Curated annotation (Swiss-Prot):
Function of the protein: Inhibits host translation by associating with the open head conformation of the 40S subunit. The C-terminus binds to and obstructs ribosomal mRNA entry tunnel. Thereby inhibits antiviral response triggered by innate immunity or interferons. The nsp1-40S ribosome complex further induces an endonucleolytic cleavage near the 5'UTR of host mRNAs, targeting them for degradation. This inhibits the integrated stress response (ISR) in the infected cell by preventing EIF2S1/eIF2-alpha phosphorylation upstream of stress granule formation and depletes host G3BP1.
Name of the protein this chain belongs to: Host translation inhibitor nsp1
Region (Disordered): 1-113
Origin superkingdom: Viruses
Compartments in which it is found: Host cytoplasm
Ranges for domain CoV Nsp1 globular: 2-113
Taxonomic source organism: Severe acute respiratory syndrome coronavirus 2
Name of encoding gene: rep
Length: 113
C-alpha cells in the first residue's frame, strides 16, 4: 500500500528519552520510516522552545492534502541547519523514537509510504 493508517502517540518534549533518529538527513528519514512501520514512533507538537530541546536533523510530518476515516494525510520532511529536504503543508509535529514514554494523546495520520 502507498499509504498506511497510523495512530501516533503524542509525547511531551521533556519526557522524550531519545531526542532524534540519527546524524544525517538520509539516516533520520530512513529511521523515521522504519519506526513508523514498527509502531515505535512518537510525535512531539512543535511550539516555542520545543525544537531546541530535540536533536537535528529533525523529521517533521506535514499535511500533504486537505482526511480519510479521521486520518490526516501526511508526508516526511527532514531539516538540518535551516534547510528542509522535502516540500509539503503545515507541520503536525516532529517525530522521535518511542521507547515507552506515556503519551498525552494520539494523532491519527495516513502516511505516504
Amino acid at each position: 500500500k502507498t499509504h498506511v493508517q497510523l495512530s501516533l502517540p503524542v509525547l511531551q518534549v521533556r519526557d522524550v528519552l531519545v531526542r532524534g533518529f540519527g546524524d544525517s538527513v538520509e539516516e533520520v528519514l530512513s529511521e523515521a520510516r522504519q519506526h513508523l512501520k514498527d509502531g515505535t514512533c512518537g510525535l512531539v507538537e512543535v511550539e516555542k522552545g520545543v525544537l531546541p530541546q530535540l536533536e537535528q536533523p529533525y523529521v517533521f510530518i506535514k499535511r500533504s492534502d486537505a482526511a480519510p476515516h479521521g486520518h490526516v494525510m501526511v508526508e516526511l520532511v527532514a531539516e538540518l541547519e535551516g534547510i528542509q529536504y522535502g516540500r509539503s503543508g503545515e507541520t503536525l509535529g516532529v517525530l522521535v523514537p518511542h521507547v515507552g514514554e506515556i503519551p498525552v494523546a494520539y494523532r491519527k495520520v495516513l502516511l505516504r509510504k
